[PDB]
Amino acid sequence: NHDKQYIGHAGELRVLSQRIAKNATEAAAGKGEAFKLLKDARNDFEKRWNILVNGDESTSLPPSPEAVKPQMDVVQQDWDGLRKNADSILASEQTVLSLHQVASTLAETIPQLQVEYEEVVDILLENGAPADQVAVAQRQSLLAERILGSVNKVLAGDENSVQAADSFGRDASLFGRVLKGMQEGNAAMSISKVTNAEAVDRLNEIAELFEFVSGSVDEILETSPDLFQVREAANNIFSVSQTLLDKASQLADGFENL
Numbered sequence: 001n002h003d004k005q006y007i008g009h010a011g012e013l014r015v016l017s018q019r020i021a022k023n024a025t026e027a028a029a030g031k032g033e034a035f036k037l038l039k040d041a042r043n044d045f046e047k048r049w050n051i052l053v054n055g056d057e058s059t060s061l062p063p064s065p066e067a068v069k070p071q072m073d074v075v076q077q078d079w080d081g082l083r084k085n086a087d088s089i090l091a092s093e094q095t096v097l098s099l100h101q102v103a104s105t106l107a108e109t110i111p112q113l114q115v116e117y118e119e120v121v122d123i124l125l126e127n128g129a130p131a132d133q134v135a136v137a138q139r140q141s142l143l144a145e146r147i148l149g150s151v152n153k154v155l156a157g158d159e160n161s162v163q164a165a166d167s168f169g170r171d172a173s174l175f176g177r178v179l180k181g182m183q184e185g186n187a188a189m190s191i192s193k194v195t196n197a198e199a200v201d202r203l204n205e206i207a208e209l210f211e212f213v214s215g216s217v218d219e220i221l222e223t224s225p226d227l228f229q230v231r232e233a234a235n236n237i238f239s240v241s242q243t244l245l246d247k248a249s250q251l252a253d254g255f256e257n258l
Contacts, residue, residue, distance in 0.1 A: 003255065005061050006068075009048045010252035013075075014245055016045040020082065021241035027089060028157055028234035030100030035093050042086045049079060067258060071251045078244040085233040085240075092226050099223050102216050103151050110151070113209045114144035116202055123199040133182075133192050140178055147171050147213070154224050157231025165224035169217045176214055179207060 019041045026034035053072065055063040064072060121137045150171065153164035181191030183203050194200055 002061055003258075005056070005059060006052060006064065006255045007252055009052050010248050010255060013045060013048055013052075013248050014252075016041060016048065017082065017241040017244045017248065020045060020086065021238045024086065024089060024234045024237040027096075028231045030096060030155070032093075032097055035090070035097075038086065039090055042083060042090075045079070046083065049076075068251070068254060071254045075244065075247045075251055078240055078247050081240050082237060082244060085236050088233050089230055089237075092230055095223050095226050096230050099220065099227055100155065102219060103155055106151050106213065106216065107148065109209060109212055110144050110148040113206055113213070114141055114148070116206050116209070117141040117144065120194075120199050120202050120206070123196055123202070124194070127196050127199075129194075129196075130192065132190070133194065136178060136182070136191070140175060140182075143171055143175050143178075147175070151220075154220065154227075157227055157234075159228070161228050161231075162224050165220050169221050172210075172213055172217050176210065179203065179210060183207065 020038060023034045023038035023041055027038055051059075051061060052064060053076075055061050117137055117140050121134055121141065124134050124137060147168055150164040150168040154161045154168065177188065178191060180186070181188055182194050183200070185193040194203060
């Protein structure tokens, strides 16, 4: 029978749109499995949609008549928006992955960079130093923690993700400035050079650790707006799919009416 094919394939397009929305909102959170499950769901949706519009050769299903053209006229308008913004998500797979990976790397480097600075502070207290140097080392210890929190704020896909990315970049710039002003002798902001030897060795370790932070600033700055766009596209997919569920229900009930 042929009508059963139309009705069942519309009822399955329902679940297809639902799973497309679910996989999109999962992949927006940096889960590489949903990134491919979404492609599978999108391809299945396109297959069923094409065999509902053009007709299936395997089952010899005739093309849909003109009596369903008005209904079928709207679902495509809700699929054109679902498919395209889906491709975008796919087109930004690896990029969105890179962030979610490199952030997960920073999440382990910034703490040890931070606490090490703490032990620098203590050194400058157990060896004697002006209060300015101790306070500046404390400012660095807290700037590192703010950088870590900024990385966490970037992994949300919100309007504050790009703000926290630029904040991360500028805080890392300030961190490098103060770090090399403490390691060497500069005249920028009255940055006194550290005289202690153990403190200087720990600062060398801190600089070798901050290497991986000062190199990933450009990557995060260049890739975080793409993550925000992926999150916005996922929200759009969810809304348009919730509407397309009702549209396809109306389509299937119009099929059952005939």
